[PDB]
């Protein structure tokens, strides 16, 4: 399984490479050392914070302060390279960019951002698109695998099948950002998982055909799409590919006759001249690109790394696969060559005003490959006949007009040829009946150049609709979640903000730009000036999205979603009408070539108005085509892929701050995470919230049964403002920022209780004990001292002796803290504290005995008693019930305690009860065979017998132990009856051992004083010894 194998290409090319921050409490923030350079950011460490402001040290070396509102906090370095950025506490611009940068530098181009898939063009080849890679993502769910265009393709596929609903993938981005490469990957994936099959190959081979005729090298992309497309992959009810259909939009026909410096014409022109066979060159009258006007003006005829001859063979192969016949293929090449020959026709000024054609070479070459009459073609170009009432009069045209008519014929032939290719492909691939489909939209994003004409308005208008579509989708998803979870919050439709710009463009009443253009396009003597004049007359200072420039008399502004765009009105009338002399239509309708003739006869191709319809302008046609695409998209469940270009030099490993950030700002990527920042952007299933923040509140099990009640407990203890959150049916909902503040509390808390893990070790362990061992569990295997003895062993007296005062009547965690002599030199009064009584102080030890009895009315939940006294040593002990229905759980509890090797066992045993067949030591040796962590305490020594001595065990012989034995004596029953108090009877204990015939030799290693000192010592060093392992355990359970 490659997904788990680290030594697999999957982990190498799709997975990110590979306690310090745990104890650390450092905070960092993104800032720009130069306020005027918003795109350049640096990391600064936070040093202090007030009510609503931060203070940090800049790398330059200088404290700086910023408001908490404008602060761009940085996420913990642990999250650098996350697969899905939606799980970040901070999603500010610099933070987003940073995670993308981290991934990009590791050659990870794919990153998730909620319902957004981000892909940053690598401008390099990364082996993550092989079949094996396809197989790896098959079936896999998003969370189950790393980010990849294949993963989102699978999700859409699974959704189609599971919900029986059509899907769509919208791949958007700037020119060269990677839309088409990713579009091909989706198809590659779908053909594989739902598929080397005839139909499959045909679908796969259709793209190569359209790219040859619709792509070209521009200054921003060597393989630029000069048309947009919507590919529908069809499936049968069983989920197998059954067909495909293609729609093309806004083909850049003007490129056929003109290309700006360094750019090329459509690939097919160069492919034909370089890949045609010798026989084809002759039949077509071909020559090198330099001999053709339409190819020798840009200064570029080839692309580095690209072989046009090789690509030609590929295109021819693709046409064979899709099914174009040999003759159809030849006719397509004749059209391409004919267009080239038309471009070489040179019109000259005749004796008069009319143009003439002196050389007939180009005209004839064209006429021969087109299968039309040269004489008729020549007259149709320079002397088209126009209707003068009821007679046709030959209008002899000058040079400029003849040349323009030639170009119009060229564009019309290319445009029609392209539509014909698409229609032919659809005839072979499209099936009238299909159960479902997955549509992929590959079209240009907003276009804002210095010069913007009609084409740009169409594409911008398109993107206004697509952005509106996305916002509205987000709206619906949000509305659906709040409804399902029972969260009362209503948003204003996100898409309503695009309506104004859209109406200004395609509105009927009031009439928008297109309507006014159409009207003006059919107006008698209308000109580009009367047009601009009319637009200003309708929207200047009357529509907030429109702007009449201050000086320019040929432009107008439109405020688009992505910013204002200035449009030049020049040629708009001609563009909207796309005229072609009727005599040219007639000339080609009489062609001897089958395909040429279809380009002028097929109504669905030869014109915009279908058989029986009225006049249709280009604008009206495009508005109808766009509404049809939107209606289709609105019948699907949409998936969005955001492509980002790393720089403007088409170079690998060179992510530029300004270039990327600019896109993240208009791509909507930063919008798709700030659109709902007004409601409750964050929500977490209760059990998950509790599992993570239980640590911030007392008495809250990481796995409480009632997750919702626990969640409520945490928020209350943290004193969170009730308005900042809402309780859903399955999730807790938070206002923007609130969850991030709770996460920061968790981080600070973690640091507060783990930093000590690096003397006063006893207290540090005491803290962890109060935080994790209250419910009676020891998940961290805390190093502790456990006291074990019989109900009559008199162990409780031992504890009261160590405490130096009576206070004893569940496990009992006794945490003693020594109090130093007062600063003035006085003796501080001793008192106690219970963990379940947060604000109480027990100065009366009698009340402590009572509280123990109260809270107790056998259980595994320990009572946590803390005692602060200047008469005790620093020490922590865990007293367990002494050793039937009840005597079954007790032994169970004890065992569960001494079982751990991180525990030291204090076995208390009466001296007046032999040594063999003990009790505590028995259970002790059971879990501690080598007796390396057991210390025996011998009590009631003064209660043995006449000549009964115990020096044998005290010196460690009857039963050896690494830690040894310690003897002691306690108060008698009549002593308790009298005034005789503890730490008074201790004075006696010392004299007993000091003046004892045999024990006097070991007097210094006996008694309560010595026992307490020893336990403190054993605990200090045991904690120190266990410290390393405990750090590992703590790090784990906290992640
Ligand atoms: N994921 C990718 N892997 C390799 N090269 C890529 C990738 N995405 C883009 N490219 C490179 O970028 C060029 C332009 O990408 P393209 O998809 O054609 O952009 P767009 O369609 O958005 O105009 C490609 O032809 C290729 O050289
Ligand atoms: O003009 C009526 C409608 O026509 C459709 O084609 C457009 O997409 C809508 O935006 C418009 O409101
Ligand atoms: Mg493209």
Curated annotation (Swiss-Prot):
Transmembrane segments: none
Modification comment: Phosphorylation inhibits thick filament formation and reduces the actin-activated ATPase activity.
Binding-site residues, ATP: 173-180
Stretches assigned to the Myosin N-terminal SH3-like domain: 24-76
Annotated stretches, region: Actin-binding: 626-648, 726-740
Family statement drawn from the similarity comment of this UniProt entry: Belongs to the TRAFAC class myosin-kinesin ATPase superfamily. Myosin family.
Domain-related comment: Limited proteolysis of myosin heavy chain produces 1 light meromyosin (LMM) and 1 heavy meromyosin (HMM). HMM can be further cleaved into 2 globular subfragments (S1) and 1 rod-shaped subfragment (S2). The rodlike tail sequence is highly repetitive, showing cycles of a 28-residue repeat pattern composed of 4 heptapeptides, characteristic for alpha-helical coiled coils.
Descriptive protein name: Myosin-2 heavy chain
Residues of the full protein shown: 3 to 765 of 2116
């Amino acid at each position: 399984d490659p997904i788990h194998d680290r030594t697999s290409d999957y982990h190498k090319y799709l997975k990110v490479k590979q306690f310090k921050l745990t104890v650390s409490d450092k905070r960092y923030i993104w800032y720009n050392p130069d306020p005027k350079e918003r795109d350049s950011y640096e990391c600064g460490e936070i040093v202090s914070e007030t009510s609503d402001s931060f203070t940090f040290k800049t790398v330059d070396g200088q404290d700086r302060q910023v408001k908490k509102d404008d602060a761009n906090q940085r996420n913990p370095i642990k999250f650098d390279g996350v697969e899905d950025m939606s799980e970040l506490s901070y999603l500010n611009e610099p933070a987003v960019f940073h995670n993308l940068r981290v991934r990009y530098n590791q050659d990870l181009i794919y990153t998730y951002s909620g319902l957004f898939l981000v892909a940053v063009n690598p401008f390099k080849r990364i082996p993550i698109y092989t079949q094996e890679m396809v197989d790896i993502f098959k079936g896999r769910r998003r969370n189950e695998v790393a980010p990849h265009i294949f993963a989102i393709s699978d999700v859409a596929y699974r959704s189609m099948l599971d919900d029986r609903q059509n899907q769509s993938l919208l791949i958007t981005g700037e020119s060269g950002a990677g839309k088409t490469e990713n579009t091909k990957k989706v198809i590659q994936y779908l053909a594989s998982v739902a598929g080397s099959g005839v139909l499959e190959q045909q679908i796969l081979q259709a793209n190569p055909i359209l790219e040859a005729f619709g792509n070209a090298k521009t200054t921003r992309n060597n393989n630029s799409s000069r048309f947009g497309k919507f590919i529908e992959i069809q499936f049968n009810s069983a989920g197998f590919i059954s067909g495909a259909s293609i729609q093309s939009y806004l083909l850049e026909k003007s490129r056929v006759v003109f290309q700006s410096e360094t750019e090329r014409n459509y690939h097919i022109f160069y492919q034909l001249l370089a890949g045609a066979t010798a026989e084809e060159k002759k039949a077509l009258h071909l020559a090198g690109p330099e001999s053709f006007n339409y190819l020798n003006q840009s200064g570029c005829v080839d692309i580095k790394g690209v072989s046009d001859s090789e690509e030609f063979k590929i295109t021819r192969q693709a046409m064979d696969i899709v099914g174009f016949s040999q003759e159809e293929q030849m006719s397509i090449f004749k059209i391409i060559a004919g267009i080239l020959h038309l471009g070489n026709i040179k019109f000259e000024k005749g004796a008069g005003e009319g143009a003439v054609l002196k050389d007939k070479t180009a005209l004839n070459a064209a006429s021969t490959v087109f299968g039309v009459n040269p004489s008729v073609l020549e007259k149709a170009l320079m002397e088209p006949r126009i209707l003068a009432g009821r007679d046709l009069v030959a209008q002899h045209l000058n040079v400029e007009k003849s040349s323009s008519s030639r170009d119009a014929l060229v564009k019309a032939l290319y445009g029609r040829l392209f539509l014909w290719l698409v229609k032919k492909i659809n005839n072979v691939l499209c099936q009238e009946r299909k159960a479902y489909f997955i549509g992929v939209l590959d079209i240009s994003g907003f276009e804002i150049f210095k010069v913007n004409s009609f084409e740009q308005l169409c594409i911008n208008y398109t993107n206004e609709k697509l952005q509106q579509f996305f916002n509205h989708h987000m709206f619906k998803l949000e509305q659906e979640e709040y409804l399902k979870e029972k969260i009362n919050w209503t948003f204003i439709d996100f898409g309503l903000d695009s309506q104004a710009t859209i109406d200004l463009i395609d509105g009927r009443q009031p009439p928008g730009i297109l309507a006014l253009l159409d009207e003006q396009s059919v107006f008698p003597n209308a000109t580009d000036n009367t047009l601009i004049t009319k637009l200003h007359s309708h929207f200047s200072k009357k529509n907030a999205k429109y702007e009449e420039p201050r000086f320019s008399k040929t432009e107008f502004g439109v405020t688009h979603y992505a910013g204002q765009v200035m449009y030049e009105i020049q040629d708009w009338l001609e563009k909207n009408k796309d005229p072609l002399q009727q005599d040219l239509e007639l000339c080609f309708k009489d062609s001897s070539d089958n395909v040429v003739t279809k380009l002028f006869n097929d109504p669905n191709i030869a014109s915009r108005a279908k058989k029986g319809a009225n006049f249709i302008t280009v604008a009206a046609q495009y508005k109808e085509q766009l509404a049809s695409l939107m209606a289709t998209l609105e019948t699907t469940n949409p998936h969005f892929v955001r492509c980002i270009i790393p720089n403007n030099k088409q170079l690998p490993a060179k992510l530029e701050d300004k270039v990327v950030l600019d896109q993240l700002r208009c791509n909507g990527v930063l919008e798709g995470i700030r659109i709902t920042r007004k409601g409750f952007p964050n929500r977490i299933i209760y059990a998950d919230f509790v599992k993570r923040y239980y640590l911030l509140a007392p008495n809250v099990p990481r796995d409480a049964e009632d997750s919702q009640k626990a969640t409520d407990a945490v928020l209350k203890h943290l004193n969170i403002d009730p308005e900042q959150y809402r309780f859903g049916i399955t999730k807790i909902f938070f206002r923007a920022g609130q969850l991030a503040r709770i996460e920061e509390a968790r981080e600070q808390r973690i640091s507060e209780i783990t930093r000590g893990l690096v003397d006063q070790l006893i207290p540090v362990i005491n803290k962890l004990q109060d935080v994790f061992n209250t419910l009676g569990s020891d998940p961290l295997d805390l190093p502790q001292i456990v006291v074990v003895g019989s109900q009559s062993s008199g162990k409780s007296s031992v504890l009261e002796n160590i405490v130096g005062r009576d206070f004893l009547p569940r496990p009992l965690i006794l945490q003693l803290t020594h109090l130093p002599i007062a600063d003035d030199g006085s003796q501080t009064q001793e008192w106690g504290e219970f963990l379940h009584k947060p604000n109480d102080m027990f100065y009366d030890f009698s009340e402590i005995r009572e509280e123990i009895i109260r809270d107790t009315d056998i259980s595994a939940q320990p009572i946590n008693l803390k005692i602060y006294s200047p008469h005790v040593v620093n020490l922590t002990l865990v007293d367990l019930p002494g050793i039937t229905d009840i005597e079954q759980q007790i032994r169970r509890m004890v065992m569960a305690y001494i079982k751990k090797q991180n525990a030291i066992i204090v076995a208390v045993t009466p001296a007046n009860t032999d040594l063999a067949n003990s009790d505590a030591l028995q259970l002790a040796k059971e879990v501690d065979p080598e007796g390396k962590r057991t210390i025996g305490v011998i009590t009631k020594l003064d209660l043995m017998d006449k000549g009964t001595d115990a020096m044998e065990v005290l010196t460690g012989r009857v039963i050896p132990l690494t830690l040894g034995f310690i003897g002691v004596i306690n108060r008698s029953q009549e002593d308790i009856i009298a005034k005789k108090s503890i730490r008074e009877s201790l004075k006696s204990e010392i004299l007993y051992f000091k003046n004892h015939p045999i024990y006097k030799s070991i007097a210094n290693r006996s008694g309560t004083a010595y026992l307490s000192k020893t336990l403190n010592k054993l605990l200090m060093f045991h904690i120190r010894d266990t410290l390393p392992d405990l750090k590992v355990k703590v790090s784990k359970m906290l992640s």
